[PDB]
Amino acid sequence: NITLNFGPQHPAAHGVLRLVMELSGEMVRKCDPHIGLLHRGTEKLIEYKTYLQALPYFDRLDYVSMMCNEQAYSLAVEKLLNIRPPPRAQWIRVLFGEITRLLNHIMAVTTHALDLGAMTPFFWLFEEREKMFEFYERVSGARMHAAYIRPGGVHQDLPLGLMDDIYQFSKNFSLRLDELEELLTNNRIWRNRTIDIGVVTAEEALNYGFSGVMLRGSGIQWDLRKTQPYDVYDQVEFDVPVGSRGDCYDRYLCRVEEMRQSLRIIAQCLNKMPPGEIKVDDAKVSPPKRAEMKTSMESLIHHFKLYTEGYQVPPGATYTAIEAPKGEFGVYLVSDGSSRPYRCKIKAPGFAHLAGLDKMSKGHMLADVVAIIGTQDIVFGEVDR
Amino acid sequence: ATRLIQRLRNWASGHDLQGKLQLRYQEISKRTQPPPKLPVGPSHKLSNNYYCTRD
């Protein structure tokens, strides 16, 4: 056999994997996925930082969806502080949690199309992802890595201008998905590339802890919304895709359905935002308006403190799962009660998937393997860390 | 943007495109908008605010 290192350099490798294969003629035998080419080691870097400082790190792991990561932190921090946010903040966190979900699935769709050489949808839809980055920029001042979701809730109130254009934005989008409906969804070549590839039995999934659509494609119905409507999801209407064959075609159609599903939800979140603070009343966690801090003393005092040593969590080490579109997400805090975490492991949903890939690798030809990475929505940033 | 070209385009489309404008024209929204004023906040009442309860 012929030993062969692959990426990072391949566009298919996404600049991260080095899964060496000891190929035969072209059928694989050995196929080990090395990792640690991106390992930023943030676990110790989280430890020496005040809990408000930890917040950027999560935009830094899921490159695409962003607000959901920070929400994944605000839930896990508010648990230990036992703090329950004003409702408007949660309607917002769902609203941009779902728009982040649109960005993430558009990402996975069009890139998976690129490895299949489709080219066009990419350019047909990033024209839209700039349309959304215009929005995170309108609410954060940054096109991406917006810090707008916070443990107290949110940095700032929504500008008056959005509420119309966002509707306008989704006034037409369904058609843009129709344009895909007229492609890969029906297209002949596409089925052959993906049909009956990387099928996974329900048990291996339940063993490795597969989650999200990666379960839902092979028929396991496990979900992190309706099982635990941790926010406004309990009020929100939507319905969950489940695959049949475990075909990548299945998982695909699921993601398209979830995109439809956010088309359903975001409608209702636009339909239902209360007036109210988008932040907690407490100045011992949530900082004062610039107007009030510059007259009232105590506001300026606690202002000075949260921005210097910050709120103090009561001591405790805990773990929380998150409904990332990619799967269960890991928030393993270890806090001595000091604003510095003692430790903080972060389970990436894609970690288990990549652990499971080699099971799906062997006995498949290389194009199958290139199909597989796109099967699992894996942004490698979260995975090694 | 000529109408015959619109006809032939929507023709190939199988869909009206004029019914869902793709390129974002005039409507958008105004950048310069009147001030937010913001919600007052539930616990800015002066009659009571002991930390013993809100905590």
Binding site: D157, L158, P159, L160, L162, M163, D164, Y167, S170, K171, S174, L177, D178, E181, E182, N186, R260, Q261, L263, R264, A267, L270, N271, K272, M273, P274, P275 | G14, H15, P36, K37, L38, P39, V40
Partner: peptide
């Protein structure tokens, strides 16, 4: 003048696809 942006109305949208046979 208290305000912010709660919804102004919001008309119908269709998450449902259409794929005409034409």
């Amino acid at each position: 003048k208290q305000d912010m942006p709660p919804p102004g109305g919001y008309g119908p949208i269709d998450y449902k696809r259409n794929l005409p046979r034409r």
